[model samples]
Target: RNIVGCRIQHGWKEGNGPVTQWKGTVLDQVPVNPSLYLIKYDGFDCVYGLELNKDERVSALEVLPDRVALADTMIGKAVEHMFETEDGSKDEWRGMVLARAPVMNTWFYITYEKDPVLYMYQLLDDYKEGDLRIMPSLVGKQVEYAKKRTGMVIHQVEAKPSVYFIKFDDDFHIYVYDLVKTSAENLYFQ
Candidate 1:
């Protein structure tokens, strides 16, 4: 019983430990089952079984340090900007970019709250000054795209007209879309 308590404490500390980089590489991958892989990292002969979730069945097992570092760098920068929810009812929500998947054009974030939750946002191309031609029409319309469809416009920029940023009902994933010939479809009043 004492060992069990000590093990539980150790697990908690490991989960809440300071962020640090682990110098390791995948030496091999052995399939333990349909949803688990026994991966061997460098310097350690012991292999750990990583259970694949429903969405990560076909995921790759590559580690890119540069991309990981970029995500860490963007955390502070994202916190500087103000964001709101999709319904426009709450404009005081705050969060930071937790990580970014550049190849997948996706970003992960977490909010500053009593109990934080992870959110995913899409990365869009930068907007140019000329792209502002479509901004006026989209100012108050609902946009459909990203992980969740039917997002409400939080704001539109006159200076950088090509970008229309919206928030979802979840009040976490703030998506950015290009106003000029963008894939986002404006939901018409039905």
Candidate 2:
């Protein structure tokens, strides 16, 4: 039997974590049989590896640090963010206010309520990625006071002709916020 586990530590709090890395190997490559395996590691009480069965069923036997648990924790956060605000600063009602700004020249549509209490959706389309433009800047500005949420006025800011498309990276897991909502225009200048 081959060693199917890895060596790792589990008690470092100052840095990322004790389980710096993880590795797993298949001891028996049998098509449809359970094979004997040996695992070895340091700094952790156990070791784990992901395996797929003939039917593509996954199993993580004798895993260390409970990666499923870790993933579960992250899933909890992601699920919460999907429904609630990414941060606790906002609430659920405005969760979909500003969605992911797309990549490149791709267009996206945003339909949002003009007012916080008024529950109606309006469509704003052809919003190219990174455009950072906004219409009725003054109205968007006033809405900011009434919205009391984040990332609500991106269209209002990027719509300005002076605004330009910059770049788009993977926006996965990113909390959306209105770019215009943070504009310094609120501060009048000479």
Candidate 3:
């Protein structure tokens, strides 16, 4: 369960253009699927490959050393940066890191939070304010929070944007950023 940013030998193919170079390739610091890893060869450019073929899956990959992990790399990987608007203003664009490039070992693939898009951006140790960009009125709506608690939003302070107050085993304020629609995904930032 811990092999991203490691070395490996990619399975060979009968009609492919390789042998000497494919035996030992590098795996990107990203796990694309269940036991499905992204492989990149040093001798090949525009080179990114994956083998899900039953016999050629990662199971066929011979692991090598210099292994790496996500911790000590990026803590929140969840991040937000500023983007210029059409009218010459700036706004926050948030996304999460998918993987790190093995070749350069610097680039991180980030997927946008609200929309469908992916981009390669090297994290530069920057910070900004934060998502849905949750514009719909959530005041009278129900929400799930505190890990295993649910409650109706008892009060929403207009001046505070997405902040709300809810009563449960313990009543407290909830930020919409953490409260999924009682029906969506989640995030942890950098």
Residue-pair clashes per candidate, as listed?
0, 13, 3
User: Model 2, 74-185: lDDT tens per residue?
Assistant: 1101111112356745342211222222211121212222221111111122112322234324222212222233221112214333221111111101112233455433
Better of 1 and 2 by lDDT: 1
**Model 2 misplacement above 4 A:** 1-16, 20-92, 97-173, 183-190
lDDT of 1 by residue, 1-190 (tens): 1110111001111244653323332211222133332222334322233332332322333433332313333432334223446886534434443444322233323323322333334322211222111111455555555454564554443434654445443333345554443244453311
Residue 126 displacement (Å), model 3: 22
- Candidate that beats the other on lDDT, 1 or 3, i.e. the better one: 3
Q: What ranking emerges by TM-score with the best candidate at the front?
A: 3, 1, 2
Q: Please identify which of the two predictions, 2 or 3, would achieve the higher TM-score against the true structure.
A: 3
- lDDT of candidate 3 vs native? 0.42
Cα deviation of 186 in candidate 2 (Å)?
12
Residue 78, candidate 1: alpha-carbon lDDT? 34
